[PDB]
Amino acid sequence: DPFAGDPPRHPGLRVNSQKPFNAEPPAELLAERFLTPNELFFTRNHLPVPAVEPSSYRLRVDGPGGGTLSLSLAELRSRFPKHEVTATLQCAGNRRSEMSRVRPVKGLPWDIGAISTARWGGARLRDVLLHAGFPEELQGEWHVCFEGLDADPGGAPYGASIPYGRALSPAADVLLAYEMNGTELPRDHGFPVRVVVPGVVGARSVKWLRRVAVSPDESPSHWQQNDNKGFSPCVDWDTVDYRTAPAIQELPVQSAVTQPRPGAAVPPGELTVKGYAWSGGGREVVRVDVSLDGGRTWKVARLMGDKAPPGRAWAWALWELTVPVEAGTELEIVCKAVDSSYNVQPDSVAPIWNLMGMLSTAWHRVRVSVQD
Amino acid sequence: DPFAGDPPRHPGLRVNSQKPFNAEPPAELLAERFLTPNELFFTRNHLPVPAVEPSSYRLRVDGPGGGTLSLSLAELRSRFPKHEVTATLQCAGNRRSEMSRVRPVKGLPWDIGAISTARWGGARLRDVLLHAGFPEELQGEWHVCFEGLDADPGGAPYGASIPYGRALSPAADVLLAYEMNGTELPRDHGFPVRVVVPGVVGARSVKWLRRVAVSPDESPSHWQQNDNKGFSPCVDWDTVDYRTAPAIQELPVQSAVTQPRPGAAVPPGELTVKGYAWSGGGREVVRVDVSLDGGRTWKVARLMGDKAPPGRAWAWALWELTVPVEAGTELEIVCKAVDSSYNVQPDSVAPIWNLMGMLSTAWHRVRVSVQD
Ligand SMILES: Nc1nc2c(c(=O)[nH]1)N[C@H]1C(S)=C(S)[C@@H](COP(=O)(O)O)O[C@H]1N2
Ligand SMILES: Nc1nc2c(c(=O)[nH]1)N[C@H]1C(S)=C(S)[C@@H](COP(=O)(O)O)O[C@H]1N2
Ligand SMILES: [Mo]
Ligand SMILES: [Mo]
């Protein structure tokens, strides 16, 4: 069994796949803390988890001339000033299950918890590349490609890329992270080194990093080429053409209700509605609207968070709103978020439906009853 | 009459205000050309148009130490390398009239044409500020404030600001423009000098520029403070608090149908649907979906445009789709656009309603009949 060496996990996780391991925290714990504890942080693995001996580990970085820089874990820790970045990772397939209700889709059936937040610590990717000898700026459209130590039966490693400009930008905060919430990277989260790409879909934050290569082209890996792309609702498997859509990098504005849960019976008087909101590209959440009547009338929620510099809001906003609720009524609780570019979420999931269940950001709706 | 000196305009414009002058091109000409001719480019004036004598004109630029740099038009032309940028300007109030159909709103009742595109030419704002002596980077959150030569009865000039980082960024393409579509700036469009801020709401592109000042604060002008801000649909004039919402800078993804027009009767056989799509922040339009049945089923439109570098898609995409249409049927033609961060447009206008009629980006719907 290729998975026998996989690490043990917290028992309260909502697992949608055991082998490879894919799981989200319970929604009732998801937004309980601003920083998601390491044991609860959602896990998305395509493959078996690498078993890495710390001392013999080497990160490979190709130089401008095609030579190779080889970095140990100790060197990565000591040569580069540690930078700490609080960033939310959200999977492209977050809230996929909601799309399946329109029409069955391909992919892991995530509920609202394919998203978590951590304080990451590591070397700036910028500094590692400048140390390798690369300039601040390359002419034309270049990419930094990453390969993981995890590989399929045939030997093809997990791979993804980001634009070179994001990799080199001080403000973009791209890390080669060896620390997560103040402790070393857990195995499930990329021990000993992962890329963290703030404001960008989880897919690009390559775990168990073995190689960094600068290329005039995007990662040729099938996960970069044939996955994590958004198509029109008319597109089906007979007509899909991966060349017609860009690889997801930045994600659009997103929010979900974490409290209460669908189908719950709540006591009369007062109810505290809670959830999360986030947007990609370092765009801050500037408002969250909350409705109890299916989106007919709205109230403005209270936002909790780090006030980050403009364009660098990498972490989610947690939100809450206390409302009066009357015994014997039915409520449909809805939330929608607005970001710093005033992007908004769409009303319904059908018009954003797609065959791969990606980019599920229509308003989250939670129907509950108020008991007598 | 304070407006007696205003310039004459093209007679086919859809004027919503004569004094001050505010008008959009007819929708049937709006997307006819990629570059909107100067005579048709939508015009938004708060005040009378300044009469500027070219030779005595001086642009005032405050230095880091509080001194003043004074630049003539000839100096602006000769001292700084001319840069050309093709950029779409869209007013915050574009498509405001559609919001009024939910509930009356305050503001000029724009239809879909408070948007136009031009090739702008001028000095980079970056170069002008570096020449004034400013560094590449100031610590903290700084702003570049602009004042126009147009002033209200009391003497308060039109004013707006942008973040300092955008002003200094080579990639952001902020111009002090003295040329528009290859000719000098028309009076209605800011003669002799306007700011053009690509990817950002029209409000910040200050016309008839008299002063550029670097400040630790946003523009204190009432147009920056008490206007062009997006609020929750629950907010009314008794409860509005301008401190609770950010000044609009980047705009969200937008699209409209320009052909055919609402209420038209079209011949059977084939119909070519056309329109525009655009998104702020240099985010490219990556797809436009078009429906004929009120948004139940969709087809992918053809996109026409400049393929710009990533993050620098300042110009709109024009789009078209040819479909079969059957005699004696009714169609509701709908378009929605998707940008490079996969932001999308929302289904309906009610949930994005606001008291000032801002940020109207719900799907544009055009009902027509197919004749026999
Ligand atoms: N090497 C490697 N890196 C990877 C993956 C993987 O399978 N292998 N999964 C990616 C995807 S699709 C997501 S959503 C995130 C999930 O990160 P987490 O498990 O730390 O939440 O890791 C990304 N990095
Ligand atoms: N000086 C000055 N600049 C200004 C304005 C103004 O009234 N005065 N209007 C602003 C607004 S709200 C918009 S939408 C754009 C419109 O530019 P246009 O008239 O060239 O289309 O100009 C901006 N710049
Ligand atoms: Mo993912
Ligand atoms: Mo405007």
Determine the number of helices (DSSP H) and then strands (DSSP E) in chain A: 6, 22
Residue B329's CB is within 10 A of a number of other CB atoms, namely: 14
Contact B231, B240 (CB under 8 A): yes
Residue A320 has a CB neighbour count (10 Å cut-off) of 17
DSSP codes of every residue in B101-130: TTS--SS----TTSEEEEEEEEEEHHHHHH
**How remote is the C-alpha of B287 from its chain's centroid?**
21
The secondary element (H helix, E strand) that includes residue A131 is: helix A125-132
CATH homologous superfamily for the domain B1-249: Oxidoreductase, molybdopterin-binding domain (3.90.420.10)
**Residue in A94, A180, A205, A316 to alter for ligand 1 test, most ligand atoms within 8 A of Cβ:** A205
Lookup: tokens for B62: 């405050």
Size of interface A-B (CB pairs under 8 A): 108
Note if the bond before A192 is cis, omega within 30 degrees: yes
Tokens 């403005």, located at residue: A300
Q: Whose CA is nearest to atom 2 of ligand 1?
A: A207
Residues in chain B preceding a C-to-N separation beyond 2.5 angstroms (breaks): none
Which of A232, A341, A353, A354 to probe the B interface (max B CBs under 10 A)?
A341
Strands A58-62 and A209-215, by their bridges, are parallel
**CA atoms within a 13 Å half-sphere pointing along the CA-CB vector of A304:** 12
Bond preceding residue B260 cis, omega within 30 of 0: yes
Shortest distance, CA A5 to any CA of chain B (angstroms)? 37
Helix segments in chain B, DSSP class H: 27-30, 73-79, 96-100, 125-132, 164-168, 222-225
Q: How many CB atoms lie within 10 A of CB B33?
A: 11
* Contact of B43 with B208, CB cutoff 8 Å: no
A50 and chain B: CB distance < 8 Å anywhere? Answer: no
A29-38 in b/e burial notation, b at 16+ Cβ within 10 A?
bbbbebebeb
Beta strands A364-370; A265-266: pairing state: parallel
Distances, alpha carbon A161 to alpha carbons A194, A195, A206, A315, in Å:
13, 10, 9, 21
Q: Do A351 and B309 touch (CB under 8 A)?
A: no
3-state secondary structure of A74: helix
CATH number for B250-372 (one of 3.20.20.70, 3.90.550.10, 2.60.40.650, 3.40.50.2300): it is 2.60.40.650
Torsion of CA A319, A323, A329, A334, to 10 degrees: -30
Whole-number Å distance between alpha carbons of B252 and B201:
10
Closest protein CA for atom 10 of ligand 1 = A203
Number of neighbours of residue A245 by Cβ within 10 angstroms = 20
B189: amino acid identity, one letter: H
How crowded is residue A44: how many other Cβ atoms within 10 Å of its Cβ? 24
Residue B73 CB partners (closer than 8 Å, separation 6+): B54, B55, B57, B59, B178, B192, B193
Torsion sign, CA atoms B303, B309, B310, B316: negative
Q: Annotated binding residue at A116?
A: no
- Asked if residue A259 lies in contact with residue A278, where contact means CB atoms within 8 angstroms, the answer is no
- Number of neighbours of residue B154 by Cβ within 10 angstroms: 5
DSSP count for chain B of H helices, then E strands: 6, 22
Contact B359 A340 (CB under 8 A): no
Is A310 in contact with B361 (Cβ distance < 8 A)? no
Our measurement of the distance from residue A204's CA atom to the centroid of its chain's CA atoms, rounded to an integer in Å, reads 9
Q: Which two tokens stand for residue B245?
A: 């919402």
The DSSP code for A289 is E
Residue B91 Cα, gap to closest chain A Cα (Å):
14
Nearest CA in chain B to A251: B341
| CA–CA distances in Å: residue B29 to residues B87, B92, B116, B270, B334 | 18, 21, 11, 21, 19
- Domain borders along chain B are 1-249, 250-372
Sign of the torsion angle spanned by Cα atoms A116, A117, A123, A125: positive
Give the sheet arrangement for strand B14-17, strand by strand. Answer: B14-17, B22-24, B43-44
* Interatomic CA distance for residues A174 and A162, integer angstroms: 10
B10/B23 Cα distance (integer angstroms)? 10
Residue B203 main-chain phi, psi, to 5 deg: -45, -30
C-alpha separations of B306 from A175, A250, B336 in Å: 33, 22, 20
My answer on whether omega of the bond before B54 falls inside 30° of 0, hence cis, is: no
Q: What is the largest CA-CA distance in chain A?
A: 74
- In three-state secondary structure terms, A353 is coil
Return the residue in A342, A353, A360 with the most chain B beta carbons within 10 A, the one to mutate for interface testing.
A342
- The radius of gyration of chain B's CA atoms, rounded to the nearest angstrom, is 21
Residue A279: closest CA among A45, A42, A94, A146: A94
Would you state the structure tokens that stand for residue B170, as one six-digit string? 């080579």
Q: Is the peptide bond before B324 cis (omega within 30 degrees of 0)?
A: no
Indicate if ligand 2 lies below 6 Å from the C-beta of B83: no
Cα atoms in the 13 Å half-sphere on the side-chain side of A81: 5
Chain Cα centroid distance, residue B24? 12
Structure tokens at B190: 């800011």
Any atom of ligand 2 within 6 Å of the Cβ of B252: no
User: Annotation-wise, does A46 bind a ligand?
Assistant: yes
- B275 closest CA partner among B265, B294, B263, B262: B262
Residue in chain A closest to B301 (alpha carbons) equals A232
Output phi, psi for A76, to 5 deg. Answer: -60, -40
A189 is in an annotated binding site: yes
The pair of structure tokens assigned to B285 is: 């339009």
**How many alpha carbons lie under 13 Å from residue B307 in its C-beta half-sphere?**
3
For residue B116, which atom of ligand 2 is closest to its CA?
A: 21
Report how far residue B6's alpha carbon sits from residue B51's, in angstroms, rounded to the nearest whole number.
Answer: 8
- Cα of A203 from ligand 1 centre, angstroms: 5
Count of beta carbons in the 10 Å neighbourhood of residue B174: 30
Contact A298 B351 (CB under 8 A): yes
- CB of B21 within 6 A of ligand 2: the answer is no
A233:B298 CB<8 A? yes
Nearest-angstrom CA–CA distance, B155 and A230: 51
* Chain A residue with Cα closest to B296: A351
Alpha carbons A68 and A61: distance in angstroms, whole number: 6
Binding site membership of A89 for ligand 1 (Cβ less than 6 Å): yes
Chain A CB contacts of B338 under 8 Å are: 230
A208 lines ligand 1 (CB under 6 A): yes
- Give the separation between CA B139 and CA A72, rounded to whole angstroms: 35
| Residues whose CB is less than 8 angstroms from the CB of residue A204 and which lie 6 or more positions away in sequence, other chains included | A146, A160, A161, A162, A195, A197, A249
**Are A47 and A6 in contact, with CB atoms under 8 Å apart?**
no
Query: Is B158 close to ligand 2, i.e. is its CB under 6 Å away?
Result: yes
Strand, helix or coil for residue A69: strand
HSE-CB for A182 with a 13 A CA cutoff:
3
Nearest-atom index, ligand 2, CA of B209: 1
Q: What is d(CA B107, CA B98) in angstroms, rounded to the nearest whole number?
A: 12
Q: Which two tokens stand for residue B175?
A: 């111009």
Q: Is B186 on the interface with A (CB under 8 A)?
A: no
CB-CB contact of B229 with B241 (8 Å): no
Centre of ligand 4 to C-alpha B45, Å, is 9
- Dist CA B189 CA B178 (whole Å): 10
Amino acid, res. B88: T
> What is the 3-state composition of chain B as percent helix, strand, coil, each rounded to the nearest 5?
10, 35, 50
Question: Which has the closest alpha carbon to B253: B349, B342, B318?
Answer: B342
Cα A59–Cα A64–Cα A69 angle in degrees, nearest 5: 25
* Alpha carbons within 13 A on the beta-carbon side of B120: 31
Residue A216 structure tokens: 């005039």
Kind and range of the H or E element at A75? helix A73-79
A193 within ligand 1 shell (Cβ under 6 A): no
Measured CA to CA, the distance from residue A221 to residue A355 in angstroms comes to: 20
- Decide if B134 contacts B69 (C-beta within 8 A): no
Q: Establish if A303 touches chain B: CB-CB under 8 angstroms.
A: no
CA–CA separation, B22 vs B217, rounded Å? 30
Breaks in chain A, after residue numbers (C to N greater than 2.5 Å):
none
The closest alpha carbon to B274, from B305, B313, B306, B302, belongs to B302
Distance of alpha carbon B319 from alpha carbon B308, whole angstroms:
16
